[PDB]
Design a protein around this nucleic acid. Structure first.
Ligand code: ZN
Ligand code: ZN
Ligand code: ZN
Ligand code: ZN
Ligand code: ZN
Ligand code: ZN
Ligand code: ZN
Ligand code: ZN
Ligand code: ZN
Ligand code: ZN
Length: 281
DNA sequence: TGTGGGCGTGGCACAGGTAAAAAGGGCA
DNA sequence: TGCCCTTTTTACCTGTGCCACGCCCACA
């Protein structure tokens, strides 16, 4: 198992990213270097290190002079003061947001103009940044550096290994306020909550009924068209969705999966066993 | 009574956009 | 060494493909 896969071939310290490792390996390469206490990262100025340490210490020295709210970073206080009057404001020409200086207004407005300079060598797609392109390389690489300490299962993101380990331990800390069913991660709870909202953004143009997912709209449209693109290799049957084919194929394998006490009848589905449980109640 | 497909949603490993943190640095 | 920013990396967020259940109804 490895929640931090990027290990130093010089000291063995563990880091969750190549970038973080890269800025630790200053300790052993750079002559003029400044290392942090517990996290073991290095910086090329005391200014920088001391700034970084406020992450551990929780100090917030940059204090607003008229409302008094402290902040961790000059970055942050600078954005805050846009809220009071008498601040140099960089309003977005298009949307409604506002930025403290010009370099970040420019970076935002890359989201309108669609500029994506770092072009992927393989699919030719583009990204707002080098580290994003690095992220997208998961698609061509199929690597899984994050590894479960219980089963050694592989994951592309430490996020996902986290949710998996929560699954192992049965830790579902996201509860649906209305229903009560819990969830290992935040996306699962989000898609569920869509059932209470009635947030069904995909609408059948023909019929009118609305769905949660794009795939359901597809399967509905084909269920009006009659197109069943999923064929059995053995018996030649048709299906609209792959799950119905996969569940079908268990008829071809001898299964006899479930059974009932004192008569032993075998049913391919679990719910069938209930229907037969009604017989002798 | 027994089958079995259509339908709707849960589990899960996952990509990609953007808001936010975090690092980089010229210079007084 | 902090100002005053620029630039890079990460968190937060929202959507998605594939697979499998349980439910409802049509028939056999
Ligand atoms: Zn090292
Ligand atoms: Zn640190
Ligand atoms: Zn204020
Ligand atoms: Zn805008
Ligand atoms: Zn690519
Ligand atoms: Zn595991
Ligand atoms: Zn609920
Ligand atoms: Zn329809
Ligand atoms: Zn078949
Ligand atoms: Zn029985």
């Amino acid at each position: 198992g490895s929640e931090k896969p990027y290990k130093c071939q010089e000291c063995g310290k563990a880091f969750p990213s190549n970038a973080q490792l890269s800025l630790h390996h200053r300790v052993h390469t750079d002559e003029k270097c400044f290392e942090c206490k517990e996290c073991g990262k290095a910086f090329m100025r005391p200014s920088h290190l001391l700034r970084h340490q406020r992450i551990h210490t929780g100090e917030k020295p940059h204090k607003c002079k008229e409302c008094g709210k402290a902040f961790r970073y000059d970055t942050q206080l600078s954005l805050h003061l846009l809220t009071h009057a008498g601040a140099r404001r960089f309003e977005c020409k298009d949307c409604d947001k506002v930025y403290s200086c010009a370099s970040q207004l420019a970076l935002h407005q890359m989201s309108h103009t669609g500029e994506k300079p770092h072009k992927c060598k393989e699919c030719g797609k583009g990204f707002i940044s080098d580290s994003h392109l690095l992220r997208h390389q998961s698609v061509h690489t199929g690597e899984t550096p994050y590894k479960c300490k219980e089963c050694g299962k592989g994951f592309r993101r430490g996020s996902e290994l986290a949710r998996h380990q929560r699954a192992h331990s049965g830790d579902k800390p996201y509860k649906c306020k209305e229903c009560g069913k819990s969830f290992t991660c935040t996306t699962e709870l989000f898609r569920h909550q869509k059932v209470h909202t009635g947030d069904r953004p995909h609408k059948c143009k023909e019929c009118g009924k609305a769905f949660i997912r794009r795939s359901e709209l597809t399967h509905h449209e084909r269920s009006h068209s009659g197109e069943k693109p999923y064929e059995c290799k053995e018996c030649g049957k048709t299906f609209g969705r792959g799950s119905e084919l996969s569940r079908h194929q268990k008829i071809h394998t001898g299964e006899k999966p479930y059974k009932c006490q004192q008569c032993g009848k075998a049913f391919i589905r679990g719910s069938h066993l209930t229907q037969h449980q009604r017989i002798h109640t």
